[PDB]
């Protein structure tokens, strides 16, 4: 039943501009909400706290030593 119901969903992604001091300046994510739980590629979660006009500030729910630019 997992193969007959398997649609790979379209996912709106975004790059990381800079990480340090407990924040992830995330490029893109035009469809993100203020306070949306984002999830990095390393598995560590995050919250889209500051929705700026040119990036999206993301605090990192966990250790930010697994997050790189890009």
């Amino acid at each position: 039943e997992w193969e007959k119901s398997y649609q790979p969903p379209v996912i709106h992604l975004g790059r990381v501009l800079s990480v340090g001091d407990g924040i992830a300046r995330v490029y893109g994510l035009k469809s993100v909400q203020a306070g949306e739980l984002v999830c990095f590629d390393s598995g560590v979660k995050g919250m889209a706290l500051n929705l700026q006009a040119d990036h999206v500030g993301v605090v990192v729910f966990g250790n930010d030593s697994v997050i790189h630019q890009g």
């Binding site: 035009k30 469809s31 993100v32 909400q33 203020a34 306070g35 949306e36 929705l51 006009a53």
Partner: peptide, 8 residues
């Protein structure tokens, strides 16, 4: 609250 505001 502004929780759930999108920039569009």
């Amino acid at each position: 609250s502004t929780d759930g505001l999108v920039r569009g």
